Structure formats: C-alpha cells, structure tokens
Symmetry: C2
Subunit: 279 residues, 2 copies
C-alpha cells in the first residue's frame, strides 16, 4: 500500500522525535531516538537512514521535511544562525539543508523549536485563521507568532526574542545555597519566595508587553517551567491581565494553556511540512 508523506523532526539534546504524516492528514508513524545514536554514523547519514527505514517499511514517498532546532533560523528557513545546545559540530550544521535535500530527495526547511510547539497548539486549538502569540517559558523565555496561517518570523527570521526571568534564572537562584527539596519541586516549596514572585511578575510584564504590541486574538502560555509541579499558571495569567490596556485588548484576548506531550513538536513539524509541501 503506497503512501505520500511529509516528515516532521524535532531535534533535542538527548532525544530526536520523528513523525510521518500522510497527504490525507493521518499520522502514519512516530518514534523517539537518542540523539547520540542517530548522529553516530554522521548527522546526515543518521537522519537519512532513520527516515528512509520508515519510508521503506511503509512504502512511502516523502514530499518534504521540516526539522526543528533549539536555535535561531534564517528568514529563508535554510540556515541555522545561532549555535544550538546540541552535541553537533560546526561542520555538521554547515550546509545541512542542502546535504539533507540531496540525501532525502525532497525539500528541507528548518524551524526554531518554539514554532513547532506553536503549530501543534494553533492546529489543536482551532486557531489557524487567527493572530496568535505564544510565550514558552523554558531555560530562556521563548516567544512565537502565528499570523496569516503560518508561523511569522519577521524580516530576518529572528522575530520574538529575562536573564533573571527564565529556567536558567530559577536554576541559578536554587543553586545559591543547599535546599531541602529538589529543583523540579521549586514551585511546591518556594512559590512565595520573594525572588520567585519577582520572576513571575517579570514574565507577566513581558507577556503583557507582547500582547499590547501585537494585539492578538489569543495567547498560548507554556514551556518546560510551566510543566513543573505546582507552577502557578492562574497567578501568572492574573498578573499579565493587570497590564493589558482596557477595554481592548483586556476584554477580548483569550489565554490557552499549551499542550505538553512527547510528539507535539515532531507533529508540529509534520503539520508545517504538510502545509508547505502538500496537498
């Protein structure tokens, strides 16, 4: 049984997620591999063989690849323009889009990881025709924009770019002295720490600033910091609402909690590949 597919790959420091989506919009396959294993034969050979084994298995023809990176990506989506925190060399990233195209025999585009999460969340929340802003609080504060039916990256591809309002800032505060609880449980025991409340207020000001400037239909809040036990999502939303201009955008902007699931990112990439390289 033949299949026409697109490939979605989300590239992490420890794992790589990979999804195959049919022309019909069906998820044909999803897998998670360890990054170290995939790149052992060289990055291009590794990805090429990871994808091609599944194409051969499902008798699939691949019409394109969207690959996610925790890094800045050029306007034309072909060049990684910041050093990603991945176990890859400078040489590996060099001319990667062309090398992947030659090996995979289909177009290849790159995307910043937060656009993949944004795409999953926009499609899942029925927001594809709206102006949507996403704030992803992880190791740093990640912001993304959905506009005109696609992720929006500005003039040079770097739209949506805080030292002390991030996962790194929380880690550095935690590390100041010995704690009776693990870092992952910080919000269970330290939600009311003066420094933690200042971080939440800051994040709130930043989110509210972005909302006042874009005037979106909706705002998706998420990131790895929001997945931590006892993270006060309701307090952050209420803090942000204090700074929204009234009557509009205060009375009309809708707040959505981001989906946090293993394959969302890879699936997001597959959805973007489908839009760009099909129907």
């Amino acid at each position: 049984k033949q299949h026409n597919v697109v490939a979605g790959v989300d590239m992490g420091a420890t794992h790589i997620r990979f999804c195959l989506r049919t022309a019909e919009g069906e998820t044909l396959h999803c897998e998670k591999k360890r990054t170290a294993e995939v790149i052992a034969p060289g990055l291009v050979s590794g990805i090429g063989e990871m994808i091609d084994e599944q194409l051969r298995r499902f008798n699939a023809r691949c019409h394109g690849l969207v690959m996610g990176f925790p890094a800045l990506v050029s306007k034309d989506k072909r060049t990684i323009i910041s050093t990603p925190n991945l176990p890859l060399t400078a040489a590996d990233l060099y001319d990667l889009a062309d090398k992947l195209e030659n090996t995979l025999n289909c177009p290849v585009e790159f995307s910043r990881d937060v656009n993949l999460q944004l795409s999953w969340d926009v499609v899942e929340n029925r927001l594809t025709q709206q102006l949507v802003l996403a704030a992803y609080l992880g190791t740093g504060m990640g912001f993304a924009v959905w506009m005109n039916g696609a992720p929006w990256t500005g003039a040079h591809g770097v739209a949506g770019e805080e030292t002390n309002c991030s996962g790194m800032a929380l880690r550095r505060w935690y590390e100041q002295q010995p704690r009776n609880y693990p870092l992952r449980d910080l919000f269970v025991h330290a939600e009311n720490a003066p420094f933690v409340q200042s971080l939440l207020e800051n994040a709130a000001r930043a989110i509210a600033t972005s909302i006042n400037l874009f005037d979106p239909d909706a705002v998706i809040l998420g990131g790895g910091v929001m997945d931590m036990p006892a993270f006060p999502r309701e307090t952050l939303v209420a803090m942000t609402q204090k700074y929204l201009r009234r009557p509009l955008p205060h009375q009309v902007v809708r707040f959505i909690a981001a989906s946090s699931s293993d394959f969302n990112g890879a699936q997001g990439a597959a959805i973007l590949a489908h839009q760009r390289f099909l129907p």
Copy 2:
C-alpha cells in the same frame, strides 16, 4: 479640466489639515483650517463643505476619504473606539463614517494619527515593501507598524500600544517647581537631569523591546518630543542599540528620523486613500 481624486484629512485639536491627491499621484491641493471653524456648522456639514468647495473649485470627483484621529480606531476602520482629545461631542463621533459617506458620496475610512505619519515616512523613505516599525514620542509613546504594504493594526485594530516616558511625563516633571527656561527648551538646559536621562533610557528600552519582537527591516523615530530644541536623537539611538540582540537584529536594523512637516499627516491619509480607493 476633470480630476479623479482621493481626500486625506488629519484631525487635530487646534487645526485640521486636508489634502487632495489625484489618481496620477499628484498633490492637487492642501489647506489648514482651525478645527473650531470647521465644526461650527456641525462636524459632518463642516467637513463635507470643506472638501466639496475644493472638489467644485478643481472640478474633481472624489473616490474616497481616509481621516486621521488622535484616538484608537476599530479593526474595520469605521469606528473610533477611544475618546479623542478634540473639541467634539460623543454624539458627533457616533456613526461618523456612515454620515460622512452619505454626505461625501464616497467610501470613508478612519485611521489612528500615527499611521498617517507612518505612511508618509514609509513612502518618502522608499520602504513600502519592508517591515517597518515607527516610534512616535509625543504626549504619550505612539508606536505604528507597516507590514505587507500597509499599516498593520493587529486582530482588534489596537496593535502598538510610558506613564513616566512621554511628553506628559516631561510636562509633569517640568511643573514640579519654577524653571528659568520655558518647557519647549527643556532639552537645551535639562538633558542631563537625572529624571530626563531615565526617561530617555526608558524610551530606549521600549523601542528596543519592540525591535527585538518584530525584527523589522527599519525603525522610524519621531514625535513632537523629538522636534523639541536640542532633543538628543543620537543618544536615544545609541541607548536603544545597547539592547538589540547581536549579530541580528543589531547589525541589520536601519534607523530613520521621521519627517516633521505641516501636511505630512494629511498627505499620509491621501496616500492611504489612493492605495485603498484607486488606481
């Protein structure tokens, strides 16, 4: 000699500027009237007769009106959604777009005043095909966006919306105690006042925040505060550049000084009317 024209009107507290632009892109007429005089017969009758006298004079047919207000304007450009600081009643603004259309026999759109200045500056700087951000420092901090060949207003028309970083903040500081110099000469004598330097740093942070989020090709800096004698434009640009993410957008965003001339706003409105209602 027949003429096909569009009307551009910029509405101020003291004066109203009015421009007629031909289908051929020629400025046929410009005039400045006192707002009080124009509205003496009622606002609709006043504007209708101000425009119609010139149409009769030039034997002109009007294909549309873009009218500027120091106020928020709805997404569909037909409703003024904040109270403007003009000598008009609530009743005068009510259903104004329809009343003007019936009287003038052409389509009528409204625009926030800063979009008119933005349009003049974008066309004059050959930036119509770029992503352009404008920061207009007047009584308040006004921001505007040019994207996809036109002013961009967000989902609800209020994109681009600081208590102590504005013309009002400078006025209130000036008024704290008697001064040996007039308010208009504040930057000649008080550029280095600790409060004035804090205002400039704040404006810089705000401008830099907007640039980091939109990642524009260019930024137009202006407003009535920048027209004041000795305003340190170079210091503000240098302060803003400290906060721009490097290499991009720091090494590629271009800074432009806004044009400050009597009819720029009315002309901006005429340019928008031409785009919307001609060729």
